[PDB]
Amino acid sequence: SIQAEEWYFGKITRRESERLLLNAENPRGTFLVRESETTKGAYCLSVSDFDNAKGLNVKHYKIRKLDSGGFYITSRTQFNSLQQLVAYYSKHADGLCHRLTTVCP
Ligand SMILES: O=P(O)(O)C(c1ccccc1)P(=O)(O)O
């Protein structure tokens, strides 16, 4: 039950997620989950990053959900819920630009 989640922003655009994440106050790993704009039934994990090369910037990762039940970004690493996916990526960066740290204000 994902809508209950404070990091779940629902139906907002890619541009809007970037407006929110590009705030100078945001540390690396600030994030939110939103609906994909054009992939039905898919979500998008939008995450802030920072480096001296690019400065503050944003990356988007597609989250797939199977009818069979699993949620994932990479099929090799699946979760029983979106909440568990978020908790896992708050500990492991794996292939993300940064581990998830703080919910986007
Ligand atoms: O789902 P798409 O529409 O292809 C798109 C997207 C691209 C990359 C990751 C997640 C979603 P966005 O939602 O338009 O940013």
Curated annotation (Swiss-Prot):
In this chain the SH2 domain maps to 7-104
Give the free-text PTM comment from the record.
Answer: The phosphorylated form is termed pp60c-src.
Membrane-spanning intervals of the chain: none
Question: Which residues, renumbered to this chain, carry the PTM Phosphotyrosine?
Answer: 43
As for subcellular location, the record says: Cell membrane; Mitochondrion inner membrane; Nucleus; Cytoplasm, Cytoskeleton
Where does tissue-level expression of this protein occur?
Expressed ubiquitously. Expressed in the skin (at protein level). Platelets, neurons and osteoclasts express 5-fold to 200-fold higher levels than most other tissues.
Family in the record? Belongs to the protein kinase superfamily. Tyr protein kinase family. SRC subfamily.
**SUBUNIT field:** Part of a complex comprised of PTPRA, BCAR1, BCAR3 (via SH2 domain) and SRC; the formation of the complex is dependent on integrin mediated-tyrosine phosphorylation of PTPRA. Interacts with DDEF1/ASAP1; via the SH3 domain. Interacts with CCPG1. Identified in a complex containing FGFR4, NCAM1, CDH2, PLCG1, FRS2, SRC, SHC1, GAP43 and CTTN. Interacts with ERBB2, STAT1 and PNN. Interacts with DDR1, DDR2 and DAB2. Interacts with CDCP1, TGFB1I1 and TOM1L2. Interacts with the cytoplasmic domain of MUC1, phosphorylates it and increases binding of MUC1 with beta-catenin.
Additional detail: May be involved in blister formation in Pemphigus vulgaris, phosphorylated-SRC is abundant at blister sites but not in normally adherent tissue, which corresponds with loss and disruption of CDH1 in cells adjacent to blisters. Phosphorylated SRC is increasingly abundant at pre-lesional sites of blister formation and occurs prior to changes in abundance of CDH1 and DSG3.
Q: Give a short account of what the protein does.
A: Non-receptor protein tyrosine kinase which is activated following engagement of many different classes of cellular receptors including immune response receptors, integrins and other adhesion receptors, receptor protein tyrosine kinases, G protein-coupled receptors as well as cytokine receptors. Participates in signaling pathways that control a diverse spectrum of biological activities including gene transcription, immune response, cell adhesion, cell cycle progression, apoptosis, migration, and transformation.
Domain comment as written in the entry = The SH2 and SH3 domains are important for the intramolecular and intermolecular interactions that regulate catalytic activity, localization, and substrate recruitment.
Which pathological condition is tied to this protein? SRC kinase activity has been shown to be increased in several tumor tissues and tumor cell lines such as colon carcinoma cells. Thrombocytopenia 6: A form of thrombocytopenia, a hematologic disorder defined by a decrease in the number of platelets in circulating blood, resulting in the potential for increased bleeding and decreased ability for clotting. THC6 is an autosomal dominant form. Affected individuals may also have bone abnormalities and an increased risk for myelofibrosis.
UniProt name for this protein = Proto-oncogene tyrosine-protein kinase Src
Native organism: Homo sapiens (Human)
Included stretch of the parent chain: 145 to 249 of 536
